[PDB]
Enzyme design. Structure first.
Site, mmCIF file in Angstrom:
data_model
loop_
_atom_site.group_PDB
_atom_site.id
_atom_site.type_symbol
_atom_site.label_atom_id
_atom_site.label_comp_id
_atom_site.label_asym_id
_atom_site.label_seq_id
_atom_site.Cartn_x
_atom_site.Cartn_y
_atom_site.Cartn_z
ATOM 1 C CB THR A 1 -55.990 2.176 -58.275
ATOM 2 O OG1 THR A 1 -55.677 3.105 -59.551
ATOM 3 C CG2 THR A 1 -55.149 2.166 -57.142
HETATM 4 C C1 LIG Z 1 -56.682 3.679 -60.048
HETATM 5 O O1 LIG Z 1 -57.587 4.422 -59.241
HETATM 6 C C2 LIG Z 1 -55.920 4.797 -60.575
HETATM 7 C C3 LIG Z 1 -55.066 5.660 -59.597
HETATM 8 C C4 LIG Z 1 -54.370 6.926 -60.104
HETATM 9 C C5 LIG Z 1 -53.866 7.772 -58.915
HETATM 10 C C6 LIG Z 1 -53.129 6.650 -61.011
HETATM 11 N N1 LIG Z 1 -56.682 5.696 -61.447
HETATM 12 C C7 LIG Z 1 -56.478 5.955 -62.555
HETATM 13 O O2 LIG Z 1 -55.799 5.359 -63.466
HETATM 14 C C8 LIG Z 1 -57.758 7.259 -63.278
HETATM 15 C C9 LIG Z 1 -59.068 6.646 -63.577
HETATM 16 O O3 LIG Z 1 -59.599 5.585 -62.327
HETATM 17 N N2 LIG Z 1 -57.106 7.622 -64.420
HETATM 18 C C10 LIG Z 1 -56.916 9.055 -64.468
HETATM 19 O O4 LIG Z 1 -57.093 9.783 -63.776
HETATM 20 C C11 LIG Z 1 -56.669 9.314 -65.904
HETATM 21 C C12 LIG Z 1 -55.198 9.849 -65.948
HETATM 22 C C13 LIG Z 1 -54.892 10.283 -67.675
HETATM 23 C C14 LIG Z 1 -56.036 10.733 -68.397
HETATM 24 C C15 LIG Z 1 -55.877 10.880 -70.153
HETATM 25 C C16 LIG Z 1 -55.267 9.670 -70.438
HETATM 26 C C17 LIG Z 1 -57.119 11.213 -70.704
HETATM 27 C C18 LIG Z 1 -57.597 2.890 -61.029
HETATM 28 C C19 LIG Z 1 -57.907 1.707 -60.365
HETATM 29 O O5 LIG Z 1 -58.711 3.659 -61.365
HETATM 30 C C20 LIG Z 1 -56.498 2.573 -62.314
HETATM 31 O O6 LIG Z 1 -57.581 1.857 -63.278
HETATM 32 CL CL LIG Z 2 -60.209 3.386 -57.919
#
Ligand SMILES: *[C@@](O)([C@H](CC(C)C)NC(=O)[C@H](CO)NC(=O)CCCCC(C)C)[C@@](C)(O)CO
Ligand SMILES: [Cl-]
Ligand SMILES: *[C@@](O)([C@H](CC(C)C)NC(=O)[C@H](CO)NC(=O)CCCCC(C)C)[C@@](C)(O)CO
Ligand SMILES: [Cl-]
Ligand SMILES: [Cl-]
Ligand SMILES: [Cl-]
Ligand SMILES: [Cl-]
Ligand SMILES: [Cl-]
Ligand SMILES: [Cl-]
Ligand SMILES: [Cl-]
Ligand SMILES: [Cl-]
Ligand SMILES: [Cl-]
Ligand SMILES: [Cl-]
Ligand SMILES: [Cl-]
Ligand SMILES: [Cl-]
Ligand SMILES: [Cl-]
Ligand SMILES: [Cl-]
Ligand SMILES: [Cl-]
Ligand SMILES: [Cl-]
Ligand SMILES: [Cl-]
Ligand SMILES: [Cl-]
Ligand SMILES: [Cl-]
Ligand SMILES: [K+]
Ligand SMILES: [K+]
Ligand SMILES: [Mg+2]
Lengths: 220, 248, 233, 230, 202, 234, 244, 239
Positions: free
Chosen positions: E1
């Site tokens: 993100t």
């Molecule tokens: C973002 O911080 C992004 C923001 C979120 C509000 C969409 N975060 C994520 O994608 C996070 C991991 O950091 N992922 C999750 O919460 C997992 C969701 C689904 C879980 C199953 C697939 C197991 C970034 C920079 O982290 C995105 O990379």
């Molecule tokens: Cl993040």
């Protein structure tokens, strides 16, 4: 498990394989993974089998109470909220990974719902240990506004990709087709795997097994 | 709020519990219900109040309840109150079986429920339950048994007894006809019909208007059965044949 | 009918006033404080010769240095006595010292108005205690007698009677008491007064008597020691 | 807090008068009828519907509990809504455990048990309603009544509310065991016509039916059709 | 993100990438990380998807009720305060790095950061999420006081594109929103519309 | 009548009889007097003895180094309230390491004592207090009532025949601010003495004195220790 | 029977011998203590609420005297009866609607909000320790399938949807006026909805209003957000009426 | 009898316990508030029941937040309890939402707390009425009054207590919309002196407070010298 869903021109197609495992052994060859939520809403489940069953049953029940009260057909958003709020409350300890699809007064809607309580509203989704195989099919071949039969072909292709490439997935392909006019619960849709035939007969005649004690109890 | 509290759990000036006494007046007006102990079994016979032409007939009885494998009861008084108590009896009996892995002895089930009834007369400011019960059973300690309990939480064991409408008259007729140590199920059945025939004096007796259940032992197992209407009419016939003999 | 925490137009709690009237249905007890110790004396009030007189206990030990005489509804006194005992033992546990007579009396007196029907626990006290108490003992202030009644008011007294004939007995106590009176005089005086006020002929089985002295722990008089004192009286 | 004492108690003659008085609220309510045919059940009721200003479709007296069970009442409407809500909740609780629709008699027993509570529990009055409950299970129709005491009864046919005594005798001289559902609907509407006063339209009566296919309200157009003969 | 918001005279610009990851699998390549909290108040979400969705839903509820009770549009500062209260109180159980931005009639365009831990600070512009590390230098060198709306949109799109190129954890499309008294204008930059800067080949 | 048994029942005149009845408990207690100068706050109390052989009831109680009270009404209610006051003072020293200001303590009493006047089955406190204290704003005398009202006073008397004491205090109150301690206590004693039957006098057995000021922690004087103050009522 | 009474049946919500709840009956009399009347009417395109606005005191800030309340952006209401009770019921409605949206992801239907408030009022008629609220709530909103809605609930916990209805002192007279007017109308439906509402209120009171003596609230199919008319907007309706 | 509980309606739909609580307010001496161009001014006729009391004793004017004043009539222990409720509500609002509570919202929240004591046999209604006053540049001057039933309205001028009607008729003579707080204090003092019954109750203190542009939106006691000048003006105007 491989589960998947697609939004097509007039509705939703959901798909699932029929294998359940305990460790690296097949426990069920014909598990039903596409669960009733309401007459216009169904939900595929992956993850811990008791948790997917119990979670979908509970929400279906609370939704029936809701619709009985409102006198209206339920909304997919409402199932989504109810599921995600419960899963969030349990902090990922309820191991239900869900593909929720239906058709309501505002049209078709498809959501993926994760154990920790996040949801994503998307035109195609996959979950389970077969989900990347199934997703490759979708990324390569999905088009918006497919016709019913194209969408059905695509979903079964995607489930098949998981069946053949993931050791966690197998047996049959089930589909559920939901439109404004129709609900087609197609169990099985395809049976691409078949046990081979038995070559020798082991029909053991009476007395083959030695018996120490016997008691016959007659009934009414 | 002190103004509106009718104070259901206090003594009156003579050491009486008015709500208990009043509940006992309710019971006296309900359907007559008798129990008779024999050498080879125990029975319950009850006046039915559900007798309008348009009723449907859906359960196996109106006022006879199975409590567990070895026990049944009948009730006189407020029906909804009876449904609460009989549900509680079934629970108590399963709690015992869970704990000890043997059936609850009859007197122990009766006593457990009587302690609940007693509590309702002593604390909590609620109305008591408006129910009296007859209990029939078999256990391995005292064999065939008959108990009676009332809304005070009092109980006793009986060879024969009656609750509900015309109780006093019924008991007099039992006192005179019951043979201590010598009754069979077949003669207890005859006596039950004799007694109901006199105490349902509004008016002529019919199988549609009574309910009879027997408890017996067969091949090491307890059998509780509600007699079919065919059998009840046969017993009424025999009693009416018998009264034709009464003079010459 | 009104609630248990209702004030009368004169500014008193009905329930407390009524509990004070119950003290007058009790047997007479007397306490006297001298520089040589305190004595407590009580009428037993035997109602049948079949009753065991030693089973009537209207004087009790609280601790080695503190006794208590009671009058009124005796069954009510049990929880007060037990609270006094527990408190003196707690004080010993915590501070490694004996609790003062005044402090014991205060601890018990804080139970007094703890009744009522919509502040408290599922079955808390519904009414005040129908009991009056004389606490007699010895601490570093010297010998001490305290009176407590159902209002939770407590006070030190040089001499005090409670129960049915307390008017009467209190008048004779004013007449005979003096600050330099000996313990043996106080003992005699209280038996002389009990003798006047009792309906029955006083004897060595229908009264109890106890002392506490600077030298000596709480002591209940035996039959034989009562007989000795009764000779002169 | 809540008053913790019973508001229903025994009188010297052994009556629970609050329950009797709850029954008088039922007796003064709008008429309701239930008839068990051979192949189904009909429930019918009169609307205490004055004005043309009412949107008749906005609230219903005949209500689904499950796919296979429905209810109507006589007495106090808002009390009824409480019982409808609890019955629905009871039915779902059963389904979650057993994975089978609740049998009609099991649902009646649980609802009747709630009504009993309100005759004894602290600081509450009894419900001023009697319920007629229909269902289909084990290949067979069921018709039950549940009263303000928590007593329940199985009926072939009955009437409740205003003029019920007469309605029962009207049905007594008119019901037979072998009657069909379509004939039963007709006699149910005739039973209401006995005590109607107003001229019947499809907008001031409500009809529900129960058979092997399930429980449902009849539509205004279907009721209109049955009313043409009447 | 990667998330970003910038103040201008009369409003704010918000931006985000569109990538949701588990480990290095992309579970959603077109995520919408800019969520409306009221008519003219948005939040940009980073960290746990579950946590930030739950918290945004709860704040939407609280702010909505508050707004009806007062009969007035809510303050941007109020929205930020509600986020902060929840993110601070539950800091040991949440993984949430939030930017709250919007417009109200009293204070105009405002940007607030609520980073992990639940502090709150107003800023001219804010960046967050794991990809933000790679654009601190860029934003520090490129920011100018007094940028127009159109300049804020370009500044945001550029910053996000650079982050998305370098951060494996960010990518997909750029979602932008501009908020002012007149309303909310959303858009998506995709494919060839994303700003482009060469790989420095020999 | 139907209006006088519950503290929750307003009468048709806008009164609460239970509160008025509770105030009678204070009017029937033995009299106590409170007064102050620029530098000291004094309490003076008559103690009632049941019989000729009883000690005489305590009327003056220590609350903290800077605060003491005199009581009239139900003794058990006085102790309950005094224990609440003590605890509020201890809390303030524990938290802030400084004495609880007297006016804040009195506010806490007002708030605590109001609560049972509004809930069914509760009753007012049947005690009135005179509160003497010293803090950064100098000496104080406050009065508290069963109504939960309180008053900040130049001087005050409550209890039986306290009207006479109040009349004396009004007559001389222009002198109090400039009085030395001895003069101020003498004034307290003369006020209290107005409450007595003509036969009877102040003695070391029936007078109790409490004093606090700039240089003096709250101190109680009883029995032989009141003699210095009683001699020279000349 | 016929007005009979036993025990505490006029003091708390227990049944009288006829099966009445006198305390509930008395809550309806409390609605009239305020001295005000409200009217509401629905057509195919809109729903309207009209109520009297009485400001006897010159020292009142008349912008704070209202009986019209926004429940959500799309649901409006008029309250009739005891004022503080009414405000409490408005707060509860606001809470119920917001909670519905949070849990279920879509706006509460007007019929459901009215039912919920009615179910809450039912409890006060069955439990002895509290009184009913002496007020009546009329709700308006647009339902996406059924069009404009008018719903009313009362202190007995009854509720219903209406073509038009009224509350308060002249409820009965308003009901007659509205009944007589709809029978004349084809497919029994109101068409000029704001004018019917104001005319009804003006007939049953005999007043002929100034624009400051009434308040008007509306929802329409084209504009579903609840809106309160200004004085000038109300005045245009009063003048258009006066001139035929 | 129908007048013993706030959970009982009379046959005519009245709640007499709430009416009786109102009679306690109406037996109390008079408090007034007046909103003007740039603030709000409060005045109280404070009856002095003993000369032994300190000047300042039994204040009927409170600060409930830095920007909010409260003026009370009726049973004073009840009023103080309400002031504490108002203070807690203002404090909690600032903690939760992060800014000073708007006056109208504070009025509505406390009014709902008052209202909750008018439904139940378990508690009694508050025997007090109170006014709340504030000023800010964004919201202007605001004056609300809340009575024992829990009704809350906004006002240009307001009076509570026993000479309420006489006070209102004098308040109606002022063009308060165009006057400043400094002008209005004199008129508040004047009106208190007019409605004071000097025969029946012998001695009173005038209590004055204000909040406005001139205090920067802080609720404050009127300074001593300005109060004395207002009293002197009121007394000589009585003549
Ligand atoms: C973002 O911080 C992004 C923001 C979120 C509000 C969409 N975060 C994520 O994608 C996070 C991991 O950091 N992922 C999750 O919460 C997992 C969701 C689904 C879980 C199953 C697939 C197991 C970034 C920079 O982290 C995105 O990379
Ligand atoms: Cl993040
Ligand atoms: C699926 O996710 C599958 C889905 C499930 C709903 C059938 N999950 C399982 O089989 C899980 C994986 O651990 N197994 C269980 O929960 C144990 C219970 C199975 C035994 C039967 C009584 C159901 C896949 C991809 O994990 C299947 O491999
Ligand atoms: Cl959602
Ligand atoms: Cl069993
Ligand atoms: Cl068993
Ligand atoms: Cl005594
Ligand atoms: Cl209670
Ligand atoms: Cl429901
Ligand atoms: Cl079901
Ligand atoms: Cl239906
Ligand atoms: Cl997300
Ligand atoms: Cl962060
Ligand atoms: Cl961040
Ligand atoms: Cl991506
Ligand atoms: Cl005293
Ligand atoms: Cl006392
Ligand atoms: Cl006072
Ligand atoms: Cl006094
Ligand atoms: Cl929401
Ligand atoms: Cl029209
Ligand atoms: Cl007033
Ligand atoms: K990237
Ligand atoms: K009630
Ligand atoms: Mg977490």
């Amino acid at each position: 498990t491989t589960i998947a869903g697609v939004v097509y021109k007039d509705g939703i197609v959901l798909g699932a394989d029929t294998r359940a495992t305990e460790g690296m052994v097949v426990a069920d060859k014909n598990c039903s993974k596409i669960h009733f939520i309401s007459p216009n809403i169904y939900c595929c489940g992956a993850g811990t089998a008791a948790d997917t069953d119990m979670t979908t049953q509970l929400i279906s029940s609370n939704l029936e109470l809701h619709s009985l009260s409102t006198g209206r057909l339920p909304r997919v958003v409402t199932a989504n909220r109810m599921l995600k709020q419960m899963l969030f409350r349990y902090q990922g300890y309820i191991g239900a990974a869900l593909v929720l699809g239906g058709v309501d007064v505002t049209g078709p809607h498809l959501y993926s719902i994760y154990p920790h309580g996040s949801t994503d509203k998307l035109p195609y989704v996959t979950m389970g240990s077969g989900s990347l195989a199934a997703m490759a099919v979708f990324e390569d071949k999905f088009r918006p506004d497919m016709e019913e039969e194209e969408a059905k072909n695509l979903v079964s292709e995607a489930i098949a990709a998981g069946i053949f490439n993931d050791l966690g997935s197998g047996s049959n392909i089930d589909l559920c087709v939901i439109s404004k006019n129709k609900l087609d619960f197609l169990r099985p849709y395809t049976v691409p795997n078949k046990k081979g035939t038995r070559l020798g007969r082991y029909r053991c005649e009476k007395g083959t097994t030695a018996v120490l004690t016997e008691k016959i109890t007659p009934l009414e | 709020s002190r103004r509106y509290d009718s104070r259901t759990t206090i003594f009156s000036p003579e050491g009486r519990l008015y709500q208990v006494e009043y509940a006992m007046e309710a019971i006296g007006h309900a359907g007559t219900c008798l129990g008779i102990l024999a050498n080879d079994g125990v029975l319950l016979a009850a006046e039915r109040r559900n007798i309008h032409k348009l009723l449907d007939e859906v359960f196996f009885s109106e006022k006879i309840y199975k409590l567990n494998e070895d026990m049944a009861c009948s009730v006189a008084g407020i029906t909804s109150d009876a449904n609460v108590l009989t549900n509680e009896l079934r629970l108590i009996a399963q709690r015992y079986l869970l704990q000890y892995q043997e059936p609850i002895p009859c007197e122990q089930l009766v006593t457990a429920l009587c302690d609940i009834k007693q509590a309702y007369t002593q604390f909590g400011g609620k109305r008591p339950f408006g129910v009296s019960l007859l209990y029939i059973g078999w256990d391995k300690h005292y064999g065939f048994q008959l108990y009676q309990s009332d809304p005070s939480g009092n109980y006793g064991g009986w060879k024969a007894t009656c609750i509900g409408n015309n109780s006093a008259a019924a008991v007099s007729m039992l006192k005179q006809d019951y043979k201590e140590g010598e009754m069979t199920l077949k003669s207890a059945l005859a006596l039950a019909i004799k007694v109901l025939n006199k105490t349902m004096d509004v008016s002529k007796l019919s199988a549609e208007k009574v309910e009879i259940a027997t408890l017996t032992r067969e091949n090491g197992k307890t059998v509780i059965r509600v007699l079919k209407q065919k059998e009840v009419e046969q017993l009424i016939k025999k009693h009416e044949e018998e009264e034709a003999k009464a003079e010459r | 009918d009104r609630g248990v925490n209702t004030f009368s137009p004169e500014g008193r709690l009905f329930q407390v006033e009524y509990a004070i009237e119950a003290i007058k249905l009790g047997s007479t007890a007397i306490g006297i404080q001298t520089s040589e110790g305190v004595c407590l004396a009580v009428e037993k009030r035997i109602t049948s010769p079949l009753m065991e007189p030693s089973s009537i206990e209207k004087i009790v030990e609280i601790d080695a240095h503190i006794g208590c005489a009671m009058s009124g509804l005796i069954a009510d006194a049990k929880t007060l006595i037990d609270k006094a005992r527990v408190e003196t033992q707690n004080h010993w546990f915590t501070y490694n010292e004996t609790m003062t007579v005044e402090s014991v009396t205060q601890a018990v007196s804080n139970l007094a108005l703890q009744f009522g029907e919509e502040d408290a626990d599922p079955g808390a006290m519904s009414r005040p205690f129908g009991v009056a108490l004389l606490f007699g003992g010895v601490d570093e202030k010297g010998p001490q007698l305290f009176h407590m009644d159902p209002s939770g008011t407590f006070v030190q007294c040089d001499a005090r009677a409670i129960g049915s004939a307390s008017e009467g007995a209190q008048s004779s106590l004013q007449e005979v008491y003096h600050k330099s009176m000996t313990l043996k005089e106080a003992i005699k005086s209280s038996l002389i007064i009990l003798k006047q006020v009792m309906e029955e002929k006083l004897n060595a089985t229908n009264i109890e008597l106890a002392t506490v002295q600077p030298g000596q722990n709480f002591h209940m008089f035996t039959k034989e020691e009562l007989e000795e004192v009764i000779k002169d009286i | 807090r809540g008053y913790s004492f019973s508001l229903t108690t025994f009188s010297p003659s052994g009556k629970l008068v609050q329950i009797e008085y709850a029954l008088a609220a039922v007796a003064g309510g709008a008429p309701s009828v239930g008839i068990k045919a051979a192949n189904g059940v009909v429930l019918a009721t009169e609307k205490k519907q004055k004005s043309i200003l009412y949107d008749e479709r906005s609230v219903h007296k005949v209500e689904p509990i499950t796919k296979h069970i429905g209810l109507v009442y006589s007495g106090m409407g808002p009390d009824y809504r409480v019982l409808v809500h609890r019955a629905r909740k009871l039915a779902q609780q059963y389904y979650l455990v057993y994975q089978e629709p609740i049998p009609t008699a099991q649902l009646v027993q649980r609802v009747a048990s709630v009504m009993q509570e309100y005759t004894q529990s602290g600081g509450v009055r009894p419900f001023g309603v009697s319920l007629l409950i229909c269902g289909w299970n084990e290949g067979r129709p069921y018709l039950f009544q549940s009263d303000p005491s928590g007593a329940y009864f199985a009926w072939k046919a009955t009437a409740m509310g205003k003029n019920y005594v007469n309605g029962k005798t009207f049905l007594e001289k008119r019901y037979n065991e072998d009657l069909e559902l379509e004939d039963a609907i007709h006699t149910a509407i005739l039973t209401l016509k006995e005590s109607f006063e107003g001229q019947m339209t499809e907008d001031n009566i409500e009809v529900g039916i129960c058979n092997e296919a399930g429980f449902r309200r009849l539509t205004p157009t279907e009721v209109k059709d049955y009313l043409a003969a009447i | 993100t990667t998330i970003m918001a910038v103040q201008f005279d009369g409003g704010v610009v918000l931006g985000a990438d569109s990538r949701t990851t588990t480990g290095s699998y992309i579970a959603n390549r077109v995520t919408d990380k800019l969520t409306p909290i009221h008519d003219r108040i948005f939040c940009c979400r980073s960290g746990s998807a579950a946590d930030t969705q739950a918290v945004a839903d709860a704040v939407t509820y609280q702010l909505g009720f508050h707004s009806i009770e007062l009969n007035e549009p809510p303050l941007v500062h109020t929205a930020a305060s509600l986020f902060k209260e929840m993110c601070y109180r539950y800091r040991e159980d949440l993984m949430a790095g939030i930017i709250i931005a919007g417009w109200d009639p009293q204070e105009g365009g405002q940007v607030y950061s609520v980073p992990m831990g639940g502090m709150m600070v107003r800023q001219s512009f804010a960046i967050g999420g794991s990809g933000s590390s790679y654009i601190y230098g860029y934003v520090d060198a490129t920011y100018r006081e007094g940028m127009t709306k159109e300049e804020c949109l370009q500044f945001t799109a550029n910053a996000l594109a650079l982050a998305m190129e370098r951060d494996g954890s960010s990518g997909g499309v750029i979602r932008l929103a501009a908020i002012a008294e007149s309303g909310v204008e959303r858009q998506v930059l995709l494919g060839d519309q994303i700003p482009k800067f060469a790989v420095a080949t020999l | 009548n139907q209006y006088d048994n519950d503290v929750t029942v307003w009468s048709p005149q806008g009164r609460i009889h239970q509160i008025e009845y509770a105030m009678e408990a204070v009017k029937q207690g033995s009299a106590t007097v409170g007064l102050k100068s620029k530098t000291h706050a004094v309490l003076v109390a008559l103690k009632r003895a049941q019989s000729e052989l009883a000690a005489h009831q305590k009327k003056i109680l220590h609350v903290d180094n800077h605060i003491g009270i005199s009581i009239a009404g139900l003794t058990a209610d006085a102790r309950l309230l005094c224990n609440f006051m003590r605890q509020e003072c201890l809390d303030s020293r524990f938290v802030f390491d400084r004495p609880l200001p007297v006016s804040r303590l009195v506010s806490l009493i007002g708030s605590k004592t109001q609560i049972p006047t509004q809930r069914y089955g509760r009753r007012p406190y049947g005690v009135g207090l005179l509160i003497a204290g010293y803090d950064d704003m100098g000496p104080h005398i406050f009065q508290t009532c069963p109504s939960a009202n309180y008053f900040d006073c130049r001087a005050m008397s409550i209890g039986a025949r306290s009207q006479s004491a109040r009349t004396y205090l009004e007559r001389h109150m222009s002198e109090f601010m400039e009085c030395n301690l001895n003069e101020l206590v003498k004034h307290g004693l003369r006020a209290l003495r107005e409450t007595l039957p003509a036969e009877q006098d102040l003695t070391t057995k029936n007078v109790s004195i409490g004093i606090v000021g700039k240089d003096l922690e709250f101190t109680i004087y009883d029995d032989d220790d009141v003699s210095p103050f009683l001699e020279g009522l000349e | 029977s016929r007005g009979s009474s036993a025990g505490f049946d006029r003091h708390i919500t227990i049944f009288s011998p006829e099966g009445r709840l006198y305390q509930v009956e008395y809550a309806f009399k409390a609605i009239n203590q305020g001295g005000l009347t409200s009217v509401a009417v629905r057509g195919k395109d809109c729903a309207v609420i009209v109520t009297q606005k009485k400001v006897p005191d010159k020292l009142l800030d008349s912008s704070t005297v209202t009986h019209l309340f926004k429940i959500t952006e799309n649901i409006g209401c008029v309250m009739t009866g005891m004022t503080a009770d009414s405000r409490s019921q408005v707060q509860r409605a606001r809470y119920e609607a917001a909670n519905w949206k949070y849990k279920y992801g879509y706006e509460i239907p007007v019929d459901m909000l009215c039912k919920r408030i009615a179910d809450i009022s039912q409890v006060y008629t069955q439990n002895a320790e509290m009184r009913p609220l002496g007020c009546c709530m009329i709700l308006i909103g647009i339902d996406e399938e059924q069009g404009p809605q008018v719903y009313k609930c009362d202190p007995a916990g009854y509720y219903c949807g209406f073509k038009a209805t009224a509350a308060g002192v002249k409820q009965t007279e308003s009901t007659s006026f509205l009944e007589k007017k709809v029978k004349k109308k084809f497919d029994w439906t109101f068409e000029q909805t704001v004018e019917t509402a104001i005319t009804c209120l003006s007939t049953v009171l005999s007043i002929d209003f100034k624009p400051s003596e009434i308040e008007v609230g509306v929802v329409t199919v084209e504009n579903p957000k609840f809106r309160i008319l200004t004085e000038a907007e109300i005045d245009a309706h009063l003048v258009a009426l006066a001139e035929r | 009898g129908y007048d013993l509980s706030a959970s009982t309606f009379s046959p005519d739909g009245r709640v007499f316990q709430v009416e009786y609580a109102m009679k306690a307010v109406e037996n109390s001496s008079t408090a007034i508030g007046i909103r003007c161009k740039d603030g709000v001014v409060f005045g109280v006729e404070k009856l002095v029941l003993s000369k032994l009391y300190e000047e300042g004793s039994n204040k009927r004017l409170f600060n409930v937040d830095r920007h909010v004043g409260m003026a009370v009539a009726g049973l004073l222990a009840d009023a103080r309890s309400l002031a504490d409720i108002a203070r807690e509500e203002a404090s909690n609002f600032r903690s939760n939402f992060g800014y000073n509570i708007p006056l109208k919202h504070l009025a509505d929240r406390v009014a709902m707390y008052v209202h909750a004591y008018t439904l139940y046999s378990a508690v009694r209604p508050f025997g007090c009425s109170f006014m709340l006053g504030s000023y800010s540049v964004n919201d202007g001057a605001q004056l609300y009054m809340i009575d024992p039933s829990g009704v809350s309205y906004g006002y240009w001028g307001c009076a509570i207590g026993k000479a309420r009607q006489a006070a209102k008729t004098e308040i109606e003579k002022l063009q308060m919309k165009e006057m400043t707080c400094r002008d209005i204090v004199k008129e508040v003092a004047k009106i208190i002196y007019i409605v004071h019954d000097e025969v029946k109750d012998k001695a009173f203190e005038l209590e004055l407070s204000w909040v406005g542009e001139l205090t920067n939106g802080r609720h404050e006691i009127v300074p001593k010298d300005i109060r004395e000048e207002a009293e002197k003006y009121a007394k000589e105007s009585l003549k």
